Amino acid sequence: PELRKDPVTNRWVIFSPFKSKSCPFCIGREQECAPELFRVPDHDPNWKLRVIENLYPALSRNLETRTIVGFGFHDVVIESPVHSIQLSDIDPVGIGDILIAYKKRINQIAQHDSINYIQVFKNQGASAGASMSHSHSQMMALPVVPPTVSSRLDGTKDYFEETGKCCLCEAKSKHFVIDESSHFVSVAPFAATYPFEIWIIPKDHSSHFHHLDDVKAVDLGGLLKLMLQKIAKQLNDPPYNYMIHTSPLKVTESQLPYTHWFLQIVPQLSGVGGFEIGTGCYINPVFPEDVAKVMREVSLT
Amino acid sequence: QSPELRKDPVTNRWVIFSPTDFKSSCPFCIECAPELFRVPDHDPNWKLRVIENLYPALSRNLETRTIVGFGFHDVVIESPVHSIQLSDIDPVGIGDILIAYKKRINQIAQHDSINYIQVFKNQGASAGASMSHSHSQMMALPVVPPTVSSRLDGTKDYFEETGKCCLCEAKSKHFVIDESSHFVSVAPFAATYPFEIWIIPKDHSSHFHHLDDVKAVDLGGLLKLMLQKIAKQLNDPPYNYMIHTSPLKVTESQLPYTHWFLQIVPQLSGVGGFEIGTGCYINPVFPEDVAKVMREVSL
Ligand SMILES: [Zn+2]
Ligand SMILES: [Zn+2]
Ligand SMILES: [Zn+2]
Ligand SMILES: [Zn+2]
């Protein structure tokens, strides 16, 4: 029983020593969805993925301006035409299509100086915030750098000021590797927030996600595919959340030395109570040292 | 209404707003872990009692990028009868619960190894409630938590601007639901959760354990004028409530802008990617609507 901290989260966690618990997005019904922004391959009727708006967005793109009007970009990414295929089934090259696609929609938003941050994420399972079963992802442009980012800037910075090192750059000497690819390496966070949380960090110190290329998007695809697969099994196909962390669009040169984006997967294994809510502090019932082992063992025979 | 981000000094961060419509014996009754004390003292005809937590998040026996698990994890058995709920208990018995907290904060304080104490309550497994027997808990910590530190930032940066404590400015910076003798309840302007409710002392106090017997009954009542409305209007949803107080060693300097309060959150929805990735929340109901439906509710 101890408290572990990390520059990235910039907060302490308590470790105290597990399993789970057609459609308007299908090809053809593509006329029931909100205005289309683009698809892949380019406007081809034999599509593999596409990004659409959001009928009832969390932030409106039609309001571009103690309070701030709810302007933002709330977009949806249909990962496939096939209703039976999930992100775990897609071929590594296909995930790459998704990752290169996120890059696309992200590169377009950057043109709007009003976008402070952009959160891209994946919800699989109703309880984990996913209505439809059809494979889909989302994007909510934000006119405000969020708390996890502000915390991360401060954390890694403080660390960098006192060590000159980029915490996520010495990943091999910080966390617990589950798998490793050409330009990426997944890990069990040394100070992970949730049970069986996994981070996939790029190997090159890059301060932003939309800097990756096709070759790397397919390589990161497989590592992400391998991690979701070992998760889906070893943990009895539990629901999970997927979100990408990266420096805001206005990130400063000075912040660049210690700013490095990463990918995080959180399988929904348990909820929270009054302790976590009131403090922001959380409890993890599964050490990362015991996640790394089990993870490097799970098979797919 | 149309989307509208809001931020409060207390949370010190923005929240998204984009919207009546919402829906929904044991070994502890008069075998438990070591007792700290009960009420009345050593009295067998007991109402409440506080015991060690058989399996502590932070072990009191550890007392010594990583820190030792030292900490106190205690439990407050709120009732002798298995079939009772805080909302029901008379404003008196609850006061004894509150006083028990205050009394507990006092003892814990003696330890310098501790920096923050977190008092809270869970009801309904779905909200973390351990067992069905009415109870609450107190978690002692060797570190001040993000919310307190975050709040310390916002309550200050806001004070260094208006020279005032936003919480003493409750009535004016929020949506009043109900007021009692020494406390008031509102719908926080930038509330995090739908139907989230705050009960704030009207006098500028910086720490909960400073509350006295009169205020404890006045509070016991308001905390009883809100919950009965929550259980009704939302139809007995699970819920969590957690008092937010200053650090064990808050500095005199931070004192003018550190005002404690109790947060009640009715469980009406879960979280997802966006939330975990940003730390920002999406709330389906403006405190205005909430403030307008909670006044109407009749008990
Ligand atoms: Zn579908
Ligand atoms: Zn790096
Ligand atoms: Zn009982
Ligand atoms: Zn005040």
Curated annotation (Swiss-Prot), chain A:
Cofactor: Zn(2+)
Residue numbers binding ADP-alpha-D-glucose: 32-34, 54, 123, 129-132, 138, 271, 275-276
Protein EC: 2.7.7.-
Binding site for Zn(2+) 2: 166, 169, 205, 260
GO biological process, alphabetically ordered: carbohydrate metabolic process; galactose metabolic process; glucose metabolic process; positive regulation of cellular response to phosphate starvation
Top-level division of the source organism's lineage: Eukaryota
Subunit structure: Homodimer.
Name under which the protein is recorded: ADP-glucose phosphorylase
Source organism of the structure: Arabidopsis thaliana (Mouse-ear cress)
